[PDB]
């Protein structure tokens, strides 16, 4: 098969800077008879299908911003984003349609650098409907922060918790280049009724001291 | 042109799945429809194509044994069938009009994928729980907890509320069940003046909920 190898595996640059992605094919995809390279570039964002950017190695797809450009021939190909924009955060794939089976590269992840942004923190008590089922889920939300590194510590009656929470972070926002995070602390309804104060303590580069959001049951 | 694919599925190992792909916006028979799969953290893999005109097919040497691609011109729909499913077949499955390059035009449409999970674990619908809100902006949301398999989709106010929405990737709980939350930042004035419902779909369990989130 034709192996498609991309480099680097991930890139991060500030807004308006140039991003370069290399793709190398294990066989030439140039046909001398028509001087065409049977290569295409795709953009993919989380939860969405790929979108065609460039074809014949260097012909931009219709409707694609002109800051996107493809170059190269034979076995060595380049996708250029001349002035990286907020919406361009995604994974980029080269693709060959020279030979069966069609194949794709391993992808290059393009990330945006931006200024520090401290999270806005919210805490949500368990709903009365859930406590009926015998469980309490307490949710702490960290909204639109940069960089992605953030620490969430749960406290119940001011006691530091461990082993009863799970968190996940979003992909990078395509408009403001921030991240958000959700942490869930899960207790039996019986344990939840044994305490008064529920808090999440948030530490982030944007904060000189931790921010605590709390409620009393 | 739009390509609309079948609903998310779960299957036992050794079973079969058949994924639909309905086309619109162009003459159905003129182009070939491909199937491409994307396994988690692995590269896109091409499976096969079919000529929507004459019904001719080509398959990769991976899937030639276990994959059959068909089409219905009257229904303007392409189908992909996998037999002898293995846990490694857990992936998103795409139909796409890959690189239609012609003298008249050049276009490339993909469907929204179809998640299929090959697993021996049981299917479970989720419970949706309000994340009750309580200066100018407030946070509310929904907690979608204890479901299998992935995915769950969530929309707000039937899709006209999209700004300020964060739907988080699911976590894997110790039970083997997934859980996720979706939040959105809204005006605090609209707390007492406007309505907010999260629309939750878990197709494998045929679960559909509209959850009003109130203070």
């Amino acid at each position: 098969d034709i192996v498609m190898t991309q480099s680097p595996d991930s890139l991060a640059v500030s807004l308006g800077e140039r991003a370069t992605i290399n793709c190398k094919s294990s066989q030439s995809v140039l046909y001398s008879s028509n001087n065409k390279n049977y290569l295409a570039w795709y953009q993919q964002k989380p939860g969405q299908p790929p979108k065609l950017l460039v074809y014949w190695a260097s012909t931009r797809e219709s409707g694609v911003p002109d800051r996107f450009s493809g170059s190269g021939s034979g076995t060595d190909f380049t996708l250029t984003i001349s002035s990286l924009q907020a919406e361009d955060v995604a994974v980029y794939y080269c693709h060959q349609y020279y030979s069966s089976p069609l194949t794709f590269g391993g992808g290059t992840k393009v990330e945006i650098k931006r200024t520090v942004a401290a999270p806005s923190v919210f805490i949500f008590p368990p709903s009365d409907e859930q406590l009926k089922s015998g469980t309490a889920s307490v949710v702490c939300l960290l909204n639109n922060f940069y960089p992605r590194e953030a620490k969430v510590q749960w406290k119940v009656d001011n006691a530091l918790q461990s082993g009863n929470s799970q968190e996940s972070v979003t992909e990078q926002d395509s408009k403001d280049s921030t991240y958000s995070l959700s942490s869930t602390l899960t207790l039996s309804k019986a344990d939840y009724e044994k305490h008064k104060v529920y808090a999440c303590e948030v530490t982030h580069q944007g904060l000189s001291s931790p921010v605590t959001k709390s409620f009393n049951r | 042109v739009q390509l609309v694919q079948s609903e998310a599925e779960v299957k036992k190992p050794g079973a079969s799945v058949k994924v639909s792909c309905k086309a619109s916006g162009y003459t159905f028979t003129r182009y070939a429809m491909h199937w491409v799969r994307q396994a988690p953290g692995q590269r896109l893999e091409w499976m096969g194509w079919i000529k929507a005109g004459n019904g001719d097919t080509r398959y990769s040497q991976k899937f030639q044994g276990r994959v059959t691609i068909t089409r219905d011109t009257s229904a303007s729909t392409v189908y992909m069938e996998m037999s002898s499913l293995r846990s490694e077949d857990t992936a998103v499955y795409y139909c796409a009009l890959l690189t239609v390059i012609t003298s008249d035009d050049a276009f490339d449409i993909w469907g929204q994928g179809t998640m299929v999970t090959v697993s021996l674990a049981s299917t479970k619908g989720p419970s949706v729980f309000p994340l009750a809100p309580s200066g100018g902006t407030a946070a509310l949301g929904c907690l979608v907890k204890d479901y299998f398999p992935e995915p769950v989709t969530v929309s707000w106010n039937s899709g006209a509320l999209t700004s300020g929405v964060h739907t988080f990737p699911a976590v894997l709980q110790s039970s083997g069940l997934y859980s996720l939350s979706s939040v959105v930042t809204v005006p605090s004035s609209s707390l007492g003046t406007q309505t907010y419902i999260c629309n939750v779909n878990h197709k494998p369990s045929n679960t559909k909920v509209d959850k009003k989130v109130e203070p």
């Binding site: 065409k36 089976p101 | 390059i101 012609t102």
Partner: peptide, 15 residues
């Protein structure tokens, strides 16, 4: 040489 049946949607005699 390229295989025109790798992707039949590609016409090699077209920009």
């Amino acid at each position: 040489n390229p295989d025109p049946n790798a992707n039949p949607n590609v016409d090699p005699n077209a920009n």
